[PDB]
């Protein structure tokens, strides 16, 4: 929880902004591959970078979201823009990202802004993700006669 606003322009994004974070995508050894800006907002997570395409992940896809010494990372299922995989990023503020993620992910943002038409509308049936299911109960035995 926090607040504050002002009618001031921004000439550039700092390394310490309260909603943007300068990040660098890293490999299995922790070597630096490419730089970007991670944006946290009530809609979803977004990466901004060069003339390349931008990249998005909804909080629904984030089964887990972790932080370590200068390291931020997240897991995501086959349903998202990038497909199935874990993506890790070097960042001087990885704990402040982790502290802000949970503030938005607990909030759920239920239609918080007016969205366009989407395939959640009524239509023909198709392959579409299933909800949770209950654990099946145990059976009982019986006694034996003379």
């Amino acid at each position: 929880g926090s607040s504050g606003s002002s009618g001031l322009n921004r000439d550039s994004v700092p390394d310490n902004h309260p909603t943007k974070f300068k990040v660098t995508n890293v490999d299995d050894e922790g070597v630096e591959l490419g730089s970007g800006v991670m944006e946290l907002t009530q809609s979803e997570l977004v990466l901004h970078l060069h003339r390349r395409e931008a990249v998005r992940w909804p909080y629904l896809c984030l089964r887990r979201y972790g932080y370590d010494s200068n390291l931020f990372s997240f897991e995501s299922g086959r349903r998202c823009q990038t497909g199935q995989g874990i993506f890790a990023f070097k960042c001087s503020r990885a704990e402040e990202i982790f502290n802000l993620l949970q503030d938005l992910m607990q909030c759920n943002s239920i239609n918080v802004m007016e969205e366009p038409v989407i395939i959640t509308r009524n239509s023909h049936p198709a392959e579409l993700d299933l909800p949770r299911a209950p654990q099946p109960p145990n059976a009982l035995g019986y006694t034996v006669s003379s």
């Binding site: 299995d28 972790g66 370590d68 949970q102």
Partner: peptide
């Protein structure tokens, strides 16, 4: 966007329990 073999973090809060 590098795809890792496993999760690099031991301390984690599980948020969404849906696929």
């Amino acid at each position: 966007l590098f795809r890792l073999r496993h999760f690099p973090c031991g301390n984690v809060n599980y948020g969404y329990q849906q696929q």
